[PDB]
Amino acid sequence: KSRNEIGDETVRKLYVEIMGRHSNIILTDAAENVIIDGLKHLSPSMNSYRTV
RNA sequence: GGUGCUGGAAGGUUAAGAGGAGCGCUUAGCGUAAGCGAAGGUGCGAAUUGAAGCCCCAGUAAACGGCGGCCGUAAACGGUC
């Protein structure tokens, strides 16, 4: 439940995946569920499914 | 943003024209000496007023015109001028 930098409040959902070598940390905005940023950036070609 | 066009004087810059302070030049006369000098005439004219325009403020790009660089990351996103 993070306050935005402009003053209002918008809930953020942080996703932690622990899958060994496929582990990643991905933050979403919890309303549209688009990836704001990821700890490991993946391409549409390399790891085509679940592109970060 | 700059330049054109349109709109706006809050504030400065404002010309000619009004306005006349004051300062020189002459001398009727006061003066032992060198100077002071009223009324006129004759030049310089300071303050104060005195519009558009300029500085300024907004809009306008089928107006004039312009639409960038470096480093990463896989067009797109992040850091900086």
Side-chain angles (χ1 to χ4, degrees):
Chain A
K1 213 189 56 182
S2 75
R3 202 141 280 277
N4 306 289
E5 289 280 359
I6 74 152
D8 73 325
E9 193 284 309
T10 300
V11 59
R12 303 302 215 281
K13 271 209 296 167
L14 177 83
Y15 280 25
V16 185
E17 293 177 350
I18 302 103
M19 311 205 158
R21 72 187 62 164
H22 317 114
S23 297
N24 207 342
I25 298 180
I26 291 150
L27 177 64
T28 66
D29 43 18
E32 172 156 80
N33 279 7
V34 287
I35 297 175
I36 296 157
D37 203 358
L39 178 55
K40 305 177 188 171
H41 293 152
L42 277 296
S43 85
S45 187
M46 301 285 78
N47 196 3
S48 59
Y49 182 76
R50 215 169 72 70
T51 302
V52 187

